[PDB]
Design a protein around this ligand. Structure first.
Ligand code: ZVV
Ligand code: ZVV
Lengths: 306, 306
């Protein structure tokens, strides 16, 4: 067959699992907190079992650190604690990577084995617009060479080294740019989740995904992502684009049909080809592939056989 | 600062480890059975602890499988047992991958958790000579595009799927070509060691190393590999080249002085460039890098932090 265990949505719901996990209320509220109309039943029935499965791998890895150091008789060059466990999250623009990552961050943090869960986006590793322009790369923003790969690699290397201090830059969607002087600090978390278009992309030598212990790809039909993309663009007319200072402000004025035309064109010329050429070929590289239906609900989980 | 723990040989001998299991009668008579001047002291002091260290990962991976199966309530589509734990072993021609892998195969089979350990070389995935000529790639034999990467990928994927049966073709160094018809059958071993030039090579897609659970790179100063390469060439006049059915029969009759020149040429034009361009940049992808001294003794171990 294949290197994956496949469950469709029914098959997965059917599963007679070995613990009731039960979200508090409390937790259900916190999950509504980031609630871009987050489906709480799906968080509970799909993501929570999911996070438990990841938990098992984090915990196993914690014990392996311990057993290994015991064997070595705890040499001075060995770290005193397991380095952070790194989870990559990949997928198209508008597939909902980000919400997926934020859910997992909250769900994974409820175990005492690893309460400290961080979330970094590779958006912060895009070259500033100014630099991107100097390189004649603006039409290519979001494509592989539009990221400071050297810096992104230094960052993840540093976190995997168990260094207790590592900075990422920050990117503002509002301004469509890197915020000068802004940094996010990461202090040896138990889990780092690294979310981005490009986390499973491949390169000539050691690549960031070589430092991952788990990774997911959020999948859906290309037609469906297109519709979610267009719907998001029109909704931003009245949120992010409403705000002046948003350098897509001139988009807040577009009528529905004018905004559709414009959104479709950014889709067909930039995001869809990025997906076909650079993001989609990384799908088979993830530990877990979650496919979404048109209504955003998960209709298929593929997980690496253990 | 680094994703690796580093030890030199002094530091490694200076450690104080769990205890046993010392090499039986027995294993030393069997370890002589591949004794191309094999240093059994080094097998006991370096390779056997290295194999316990890998044992810990294999045992942890088997428990994680069971802990995952239990949690999913042992569904019909999940496999009945862990899939094979796959180790890659990489390095220059003549660096000692083959011997390293055979020592590892013999040692790791001693545990009851995984008595069935297999070894496959990617040599069997080179295109036959007739195909390489058709492709104009004969001068590139050993280079990445000289292998049927698709077949190599299918084979490893089939093994990591938990198939009962997976066949790899067979390469003959004597005849310098694939043996028509010949197959090695791999039957869901507990561990598969995959040895070759190219096992940690990178590609735009899902690559073979994506299916490894552990990987080793055998390293040494480029000068020293040259020296072992020549010496092996000189020594092949006696063994492989002498046999009249050898593709390189003509190299038998070479004097010492003539062999050196011819070996040095092949090294400088083919095997050194293949090392620098294609094999070396993969060194940092390995879970473990072993660097060997001029005299073949390990002088440096780098193990990925857990
Ligand atoms: C409609 C929509 C959906 C999801 C995410 C963003 C989004 O709109 C962002 C404003 S319009 C737009 N669509 N693609 C882009 C450009 C080419 N790409 C990006 O901004 C970009 C680059 C790297 C990573 C992520 C993004 C993006 F998600 F889209 F914000 N832009 C400016
Ligand atoms: C001197 C020596 C050392 C190690 C292995 C083989 C070996 O000699 C084989 C005959 S001389 C030679 N040295 N390199 C080669 C050629 C370029 N490469 C190979 O034979 C080859 C090709 C693919 C994979 C592995 C090998 C090799 F390891 F060298 F056997 N030859 C024919």
């Amino acid at each position: 067959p294949s290197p994956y265990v496949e469950f469709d949505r029914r098959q997965w719901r059917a599963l007679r699992m070995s613990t009731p996990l039960a979200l508090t209320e409390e937790e259900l509220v916190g999950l509504r907190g980031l609630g871009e109309q987050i489906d709480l039943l799906e968080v509970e029935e799909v993501y929570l079992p999911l996070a438990r499965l990841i938990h098992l791998q984090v915990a196993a890895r914690q014990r392996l650190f311990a057993a290994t150091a015991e064997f070595l008789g705890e040499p001075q060059q060995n770290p005193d604690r397991p380095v952070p466990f790194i989870i990559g999250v990949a997928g198209s623009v508008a597939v909902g990577k980000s919400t997926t990552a934020r859910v997992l961050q909250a769900l994974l943090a409820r175990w005492d084995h690893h309460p400290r869960v961080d979330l970094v986006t590779t958006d912060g590793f895009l070259y500033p617009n100014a630099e991107l322009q100097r390189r004649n790369l603006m039409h290519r923003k979001g494509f592989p060479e539009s990221y400071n790969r050297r810096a992104l690699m230094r960052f993840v290397t540093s976190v995997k080294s168990g260094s207790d201090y590592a900075c990422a830059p920050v990117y503002s969607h509002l301004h469509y740019d890197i915020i000068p002087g802004a940094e996010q600090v990461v202090r040896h978390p138990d889990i780092l989740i690294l979310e981005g278009l490009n986390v499973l992309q491949t390169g000539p030598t050691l690549m960031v995904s070589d430092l991952f212990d788990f990774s997911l790809y959020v999948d859906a039909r290309i037609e469906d992502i297109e519709q979610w993309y267009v719907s998001r663009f029109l909704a931003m007319r009245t949120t992010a684009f409403a705000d002046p200072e948003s350098h897509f402000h001139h988009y807040a004025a577009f009528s529905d049909s004018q905004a559709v035309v414009a959104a479709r064109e950014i889709w067909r010329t930039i995001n869809r080809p990025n997906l076909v050429e650079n993001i989609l070929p990384t799908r088979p590289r993830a530990t877990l592939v979650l496919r979404k239906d048109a209504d955003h609900s998960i209709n298929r989980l593929r997980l690496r056989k253990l």
